Design a protein around this ligand. Structure first.
Ligand SMILES: [Mg+2]
Ligand SMILES: [Mg+2]
Ligand SMILES: [Mg+2]
Ligand SMILES: [Mg+2]
Lengths: 22, 15, 561, 205, 486, 139, 136, 12
């Protein structure tokens, strides 16, 4: 007989940065 | 009377 | 557990009663009308409201077959076994008799087939779709589902034929909470002092099980109230105490003072102990705030009699050290409505969209457990003028302020949520936030006058022993420009000198209660290092801002009608 | 908007798919200064998600043929922050400008807000309009709510006095003095600079 | 291990004992009053406080059946097995007797079902939700849970019926620390010269898992001290040394001086060595600082009988090189409170909202291990007047100063946290930071005068050979305008 | 080793740690060494990977829980101690943090004498001057 | 200049790269005044961005030799605000200055696929409108 | 008396 399997690894996120204008 | 999850898993795996 | 153990949801109760009984009690009538009845219902609402309780009531009362499916229970390890379980369940229910399927926490086995990435899940959802409609779909069996997240459900499941009607078992009203209290206190011993009407009135956001917890807590207090006079009795508890226990109203008050709605467990504020007598001065501002918060929540009949909604927002502004945060704490401690204290920059986040997501969650919590008061400390930190920075983080501040604008006034339900803002730089606040409808009342908290500084000093010395002969009129008369913080500083310096003298006297006595109260000399020497906090520049800046607001007062007259 | 990759544009696509499914529909984009924000400038290591969202909205608004009529209503406070791409003809053409009410408009506002309100029979609202000469609809709403609150306070005081003397409705409408006192705290909502910039934007276009 | 080994939290102990014992010892009371007791508890608090210890004590003491479930223990690779494991666990717990189920580190198997993205996580959380409070319902099964962060748990789990009540096992106090010290020094053989009251007094932010560390370190100091002198004798250890081993007070003093609370281990400051005798002059300033930092700590009784809260903050301003940082070092050295040191702009970050996160984390670590002295060197860097920049830097520095304002005087518990500020440009400070209640005292550190200069010279030459005939008075007279640095 | 415990399946990294600790405690008093522990202790608060959180929690439970350990010693090695879960830097899990830092002149002389013990040198060679001239060289 | 990340010589740079890749091509630069605007001196962030855009345009337009057969087409209404540094000879020297018959032809082409009434003449609209345009 | 993680993983 066969069998199944579950897998959940990770994802990809987005960050936000701040700058300093002269 | 005491039991841990691993003990139970191993017991059920025995059968 | 019958139908009389559920309170506060009579409409939903009838909505489910008809669908469950009439097609299974008088089917012939449905042959007379001509069409078939709905055979699928989805109950949704916040947790702890009575969804599973209603399912249990239907199972116990209705005489038809009842099949129970927990959400994750269907899943299994062998290949193509989950669908086999669903087929077996439906066939077993159908073959024997007309039956009710109940799917508890359906959100677990309906991941929408679009955001999910698994395989077994996407076939089990399709198997449910096929079972609910198709060739030989369903013959005289009804399906009830319960969920807390109706938006996490596959839209195909929310179609006529599969789940035609969505019942919303939401937060109850005051009458609903009174009914719940009467239900949960019907099988216990109460003293005559107990008054459930006021108890339901003072409850403001509790839903279902929350009320139950209160009762339990009250009972628990009684258990620990009449067991200190009696020993543990390891062998057996005597029967003179088992009878005549009684649950006093004081126990209920105590249990109510140490509990909050389950929705606000994350936003529980530390129990600060301040009172209205703790706030010196600002008498008219205290009365205005008290009435503008207490009238919508205590006297709603008049508002609907006049047919107008109340004012919601308010913004305190003034020099630092005048009593803004102190007033907010007084509201938090005295006013009955729930309090959500949120700091200024707490809600910002490095990631993309979590600032606005955090604001939306906070306001959703506020609108759930209404009536609620939301305190925005230093409102100029998160709500600054839009489009003033040429170099930014992708316009995150502008998006935050737009989220605030839309959330505090938009396509909402106009519930009782009162926003309190506190900023000492009111010139930087974006103009849109100060429009009536968002923060309509701008209260200026000026520096105390001569008669107000004395009140502040008495408020700050209300729990301190003093000499009999001194008079706090000289201290007030001699400041003339101080703020509340400066008077507090004077008091603290005096206390420090008193403690120093006490320590020195103790050391002298040990070498070979000297100071039971503060002496006049301890004030005389403590005000030699006393200076005003706010200079004249900031004072005239705030006065100019006030005059800019009063500039709308020009060209007015008695406007006699 | 969402932190994850794709989620944002996926959400705009789902929203417009729903809009197309139930055609005809009216998709109201409130406060466009958050979606259609100006991009001209430099990159502050934001990630380019705002640019992708704006491009997705632009591509998904221009692909509406005659079939599946979908009318999008925009509403923004600051009209200078909206990216010009949206304003290009063929994508979002009509520009309605909502000015501040005049005296007749103000009277209309007052009568429209007081539909379900018992009032003194000997009460005229022309005076209030004539007095407020730079107000906005929100300001008039604030005035009426203040009058209602004073009326409620008087009602509660009368009820308390009646209860105290005990050991049918004293005030059945917002009286004259209630409205007279309500405007003592009636400020102006919009200053002159905002009106100036809005007039400049209107006359420019 | 019994209940007499969890000293420090008597209230929480009784609060657990109620539903752990009364519904089993005397069930008559609940049937007499009618309502059922709570059957759900969640112990939360900072790490190393006694949560697992209390669970162990409950397991050892109660006669009921106990079932231990570690957090990441139920999940398996097979699809549909985690929920099967939970079902089997609860079925085993309920099939035998009235049992107790302890779930340790429960925050790892309840990620809110909304912020998580997996698929097994949702199913496990839903299984737990339905199985603790669903149709059928539990029967004489009470569930205990422990976590270090409760806010990262599904709101549906923090409801009556599932987790009835949340116990807060927090940081002990002086009496609690004394109780812990008595408990942990009950099996060792101490010397006659050791008292435990002083040790509990000088120990300030210790969470109770640090008291055991202190005791073990003292014992190890004794062991090494008495082993390095007497021969190793690897063949066999003589018994004349074991019977006379003892543990002196000096060992405890050494261990105390060479350790810090586990909560401040990240922010441990390098051991600088300055003393009040190293700083010349500034006698009045030294007295003022000593009082401001010692009176609230040593004599809380006086403050509470006078019904007034002590003054906390203080700022130093003056010309550079006069002794501000030197005074800060002396305080950090020989004051009896924890020290947190930060440079001027050290807490800035490029990410959005991260600077405020840093300032909030530091002020939370400061409030946890109170009393604590937070030294903010060069305040003008981190706290500048708001709205002064015509060209904005992203609107960050304003937010940073706002976060400071709300963190030094806002909706807080009024703990003993003193803020030392030091700057040489007071004009560029936000005026809302100088308000009393944030930085009450403003101390000017002026240039030394002749006597001050002489005292400074004597202090700097404390450890230095000099001529017997050398006179430093002429040096003090010659300058007339110098600073300590000169 | 640090990253070698991570696995493809959900619920296998924790199984790997369980097996490792059980083998260590199965037979005899044992020493465990986790090289580069900072790679599997991302602080559980700044990280979004749920596998990372689960493995951190499993490590915490294995190090100090009910029936924690029976005569077993654990050693870790890291370059970034501040990037570790504070729950791991407590007494009972990691109680003594030894600082193996840069040596001084004497230590550098010792290192030179150790490394030049198997190679054959010339008569006109000294290590005291060579050790003293070196300043920043570590190990 | 709306591509960000130094769009000045990034968006225009990639536009010129795509133009030179598909040689020959026609670059229709709409609203040349709005782009150039006679940068001169402004002393600000907007002035700096305009100067960077002008420098990118000059360095991506003056570098076109006889190869790649490039051709830049610009259009403006007010030539006063155009930069004289771009109207110099050797880069862009042509100046095409831009009636009733044209208005009539535009009106007849706009009403091609339109069911107009047969009893209607468009010469009256062409004669009445003199200083109008196709947009009007 | 020495083992490594990958050794045990290979064994089983
Ligand atoms: Mg339920
Ligand atoms: Mg404040
Ligand atoms: Mg533990
Ligand atoms: Mg310094």
């Amino acid at each position: 007989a066969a069998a199944a399997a579950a897998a959940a690894a990770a994802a990809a996120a987005v960050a936000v940065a701040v700058a300093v204008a002269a | 009377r005491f039991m841990s999850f691993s003990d139970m898993v191993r017991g059920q795996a025995d059968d | 557990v019958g139908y009389d153990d559920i309170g506060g949801c009579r409409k939903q109760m009838a909505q489910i009663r008809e669908m469950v009984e009439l097609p299974l009690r008088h089917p012939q009538l449905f042959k007379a009308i001509g069409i078939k009845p709905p055979r699928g219902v989805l109950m949704y609402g916040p947790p702890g409201t009575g969804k599973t309780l209603m399912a249990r009531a239907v199972a116990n009362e209705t005489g038809a077959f009842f099949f129970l499916i927990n959400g994750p229970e269907v899943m299994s390890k062998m290949a193509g076994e989950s669908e086999s379980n669903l087929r077996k369940a439906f066939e077993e229910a159908e073959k024997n008799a007309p039956a009710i399927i109940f799917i508890d926490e359906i959100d677990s086995i309906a991941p929408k087939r679009d955001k999910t990435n698994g395989e077994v899940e996407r076939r089990v959802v399709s198997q449910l779709l096929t079972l609910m409609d198709g060739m030989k779909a369903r013959s005289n069996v009804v399906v009830i589902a319960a969920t807390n997240r109706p938006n996490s459900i596959d839209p195909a499941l929310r179609r006529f034929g599969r789940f035609d009607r969505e019942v919303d078992i939401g937060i109850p009203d005051a009458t609903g909470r009174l009914e719940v209290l009467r239900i949960h206190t019907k099988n216990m011993k109460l003293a005559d002092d107990v008054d459930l009407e006021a108890l339901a009135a003072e409850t403001h956001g509790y839903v279902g099980a929350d009320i139950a917890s209160l009762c339990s807590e009250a009972a628990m207090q009684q258990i620990r109230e009449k067991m200190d006079l009696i020993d543990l009795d390891e062998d057996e508890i005597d029967a003179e105490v088992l009878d005549s226990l009684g649950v006093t109203m004081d126990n209920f008050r105590f249990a109510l003072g140490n509990s909050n709605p389950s929705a606000l467990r994350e936003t529980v504020v530390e129990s600060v102990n301040v009172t209205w007598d703790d706030v010196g001065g600002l008498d008219e501002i205290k009365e205005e705030l008290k009435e503008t918060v207490e009238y919508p929540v205590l006297h709603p009949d008049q508002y609907t009699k006049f047919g107008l909604s109340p004012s919601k927002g308010v913004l305190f502004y003034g020099p630092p050290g005048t009593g803004k945060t102190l007033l907010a704490k007084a509201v938090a401690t005295e006013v009955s409505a729930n309090f959500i204290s949120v700091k200024g920059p707490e809600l910002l986040s490095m990631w993309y969209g979590e600032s606005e997501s955090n604001i939306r969650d906070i306001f959703d919590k506020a609108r759930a457990a209404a009536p609620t008061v939301v305190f925005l400390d230093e409102l100029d930190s998160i709500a600054k003028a839009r489009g003033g920075s040429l170099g930014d983080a992708g316009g995150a501040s502008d998006r935050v302020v737009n989220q605030l604008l839309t959330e505090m006034d938009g396509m909402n339900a106009k519930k009782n949520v009162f926003v309190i803002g506190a900023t000492n730089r009111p010139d930087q606040i974006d103009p849109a936030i100060l429009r009536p409808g968002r923060l309509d009342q701008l209260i200026y908290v000026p520096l105390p006058d001569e008669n107000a500084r004395l009140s502040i000093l008495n408020a700050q010395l209300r729990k301190t022993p003093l000499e009999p002969g001194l008079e706090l009129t000289a201290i007030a008369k001699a400041t003339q420009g101080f703020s509340g913080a400066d008077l507090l500083y004077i008091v603290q310096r005096a206390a420090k000198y008193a403690i120093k003298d006490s320590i020195e006297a103790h050391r002298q006595h040990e070498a070979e209660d000297p100071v039971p109260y503060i002496t006049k000399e301890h004030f005389a020497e403590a005000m030699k290092t006393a200076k005003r906090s706010v200079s004249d520049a900031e004072l005239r800046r705030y006065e100019a801002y006030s005059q800019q607001m009063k500039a709308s007062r020009g060209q007015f007259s008695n406007f006699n009608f | 908007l969402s932190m994850w990759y794709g989620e944002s544009e996926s959400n705009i696509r789902d929203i417009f798919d729903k809009a197309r499914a139930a055609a005809p529909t009216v998709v109201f984009l409130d406060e466009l200064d958050s979606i259609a924000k100006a991009r001209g400038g430099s990159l502050g290591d934001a990630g380019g998600a705002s640019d992708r969202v704006v491009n997705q909205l632009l591509t998904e608004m221009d692909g509406m043929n005659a079939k599946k009529n979908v009318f999008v209503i925009g509403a923004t406070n600051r009209p200078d922050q909206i990216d010009p791409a949206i304003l290009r003809p063929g994508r979002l053409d009509q520009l309605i400008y909502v000015p501040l009410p005049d005296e007749n408009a103000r009277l209309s506002i007052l009568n429209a807000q007081l539909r379900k309100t018992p009032l003194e029979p000997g009460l005229e609202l022309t005076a209030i309009a004539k007095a407020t000469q730079g107000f906005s609809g929100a300001d008039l709403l604030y005035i009426v709510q203040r009058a209602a609150k004073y009326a409620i306070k008087d009602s509660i005081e009368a009820h308390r006095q009646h209860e105290a003397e005990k050991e049918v409705d004293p005030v059945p409408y917002i009286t004259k003095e209630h409205f007279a006192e309500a405007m003592k705290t009636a400020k102006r909502s919009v200053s002159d600079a905002e009106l100036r910039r809005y007039e400049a934007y209107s006359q420019q276009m």
